[PDB]
């Protein structure tokens, strides 16, 4: 409430991936220590912790020993189970707490928590069995997306039915889990807003990102967005209803979707720093990283400036060979790798904020070095 | 030349302290592993890094086994002797060389260099016994300052002249060491510019900053630097110059004295990453810290524009209580602690970045905090 966590104190991570070693790094600045557990020897995070703990993130046991050595906990890993997070919560330190978590994880009852925010979505229904996808296909017609409702990307997620042509694909997915079906709203660009609350209710906003997925992977993100200065005003209101009607602690990072007729809909939660915010290392006068330190640990919030235009560049592993034969070339690129040691087609290996005064330029750049001709295309 | 060291390759420190420790944070951003070598255990440096080597900067075998598990070695500590430092450039892989280092480890050697670079300096001689003091004296007169040639460390280990009152004191300096006595120049400020040159020779320069020393230890860098266009680009000129004469590969800190009457002197120079540009952390596009990286791993170096001013102030082991109690009233201050456990009381014990877009109210900001009355008097 009015619990500092000082520096000298260690701070907690629950996941070892690039975002816990992003975390690490900007507490290491401020002399926090770190431990971390992961089930993987070695991890990102691992890299820069003091304490490493490998094991399960269900291995109530280690999550014990993990509370047990800091001073607060945190977690970056999302899929972890909220029945964890309630152990913490009670025995240990994590001011985040284990409500948004749940809310979030599910794309139901996600879609549920911003509602009862007042905050427009795509129109949308639960299916569990084909009857209830032939129903909601009725229902929302044709342009339309089903989505699982939890944690189930890796080479599926979604099928997006652009006609009847695309049910029997659906089908199938509706049979592997469960899935919501929504509307498809006619968007110009997608948008993402990193909102921030400290433990004593203090609130920053980062700038509104413009972002760009190809195959449903984040490929860049453009800063400052390009939409009118209204919708970047809506969109960052939009963000503050949420952290104050979430009760937010810590970071949340809010994908959006933009139209041509200056309306926002949210899209999806993140309780967590956000791909779309890496860009604010090198852009920002606070990190997404530093400032989620700041946030639990309860100290003053950093100033969220956009201090020069930025274009965000993810390397996959697809990338990665081809970043480390170009790394002459990158002039005006701020370079960040991961650590990861086993390269996968998609696995994100680092990004590369690329500044510039001028965004179209930073663009070209991205464009000039040919790393990502498959997402050009 | 040609050489680049990549990212996922290991960069050997020697010295372990918050130079080694800002080396290797910046380092693992880009995605390297780090190895130092220090005389104590768990020092800042060992708390990032990958590798620990605990033993003393004259133990060979031990420098040996750093270099032979580091693709790349760079160092915080200076003092390393010439059997090290060759066995260093040509059985590992030094690109800073021994050459420069050599140079800036005599204030005589050093001051020599810089006049023969083509640059001012303020009007000195070498006193290696009681005649050359007394010979110096007389032609140099008061005020002047007698200074040790060599052991740059705590203990004043220099006499102010204003009268021959002051002579006696002298005379038992010039007694225990060689010296140098320089005539004393009137400032009005003195200032510092980091300068940059990778091993293929590109360049960057930082922005002029102003220093404040209190009892011969910095206490506040501001940039950019209260002085004139005409001052502020006689530094940066005066800069590029010793880094090509010197054929720098690194990092140079030049630190001057700027007079009322728009002349620059140059004071002394360290071949390393240096306490008056860790204002580069915050305030600029990129740090002093990320550039040594990029410098010796032959990386294009990054940008140094300043993008917003800052005053950066010293925490020292006196401050670091006020630092703490007053942690709630740190908004737009950026805070760096780097691990240290014993504090003693003229010990860094880390910074903190007061950024804003008037300066005036960053220094206001210092005051205000009341941690430093003792430096302010
Ligand atoms: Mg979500
Ligand atoms: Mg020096």
Known sequence: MTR????????????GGQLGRMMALAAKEMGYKIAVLDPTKNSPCAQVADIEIVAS???????????????????????????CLQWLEKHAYLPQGSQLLSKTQNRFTEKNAIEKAGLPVATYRLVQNQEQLTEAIAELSYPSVLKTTTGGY???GQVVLRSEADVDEARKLANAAECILE??????????????????????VFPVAENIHVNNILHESIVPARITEELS????????????????????????????????????????????????????????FGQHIRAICN??????????????????????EGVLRQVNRLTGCYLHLYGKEEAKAQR?????????????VALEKAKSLHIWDHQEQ
């Open 154 to 156: 890796d080479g599926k």
């Open 183 to 204: 509307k498809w709203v006619p968007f110009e660009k997608e948008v993402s807003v990193i909102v921030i609350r400290s433990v004593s209710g203090e609130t920053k």
């Open 57 to 83: 993130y269900d291995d109530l046991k280690a999550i014990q020993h993990l509370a047990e050595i800091s001073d607060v906990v945190t977690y970056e890993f999302e899929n972890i189970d909220y029945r």
């Open 299 to 320: 100290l003053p919030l950093g100033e969220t400036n956009l201090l020069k235009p930025v274009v965000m560049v993810n390397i996959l592993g697809e990338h990665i």
């Open 4 to 15: 500092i966590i000082l520096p000298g104190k260690t701070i907690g991570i629950i996941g």
């Open 233 to 288: 005003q809506k969109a960052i209101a939009y963000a503050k209803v949420l952290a104050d009607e979430l009760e937010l602690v810590g970071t949340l990072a809010v994908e959006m979707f933009a139209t041509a007729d200056g309306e926002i809909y949210i899209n999806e939660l993140a309780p967590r720093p956000h791909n779309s915010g890496h860009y604010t290392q090198d852009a920002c006068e606070t990190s997404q």
């Open 348 to 360: 994100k290996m680092g990004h590369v904020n690329i500044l510039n005064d001028n965004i179209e």
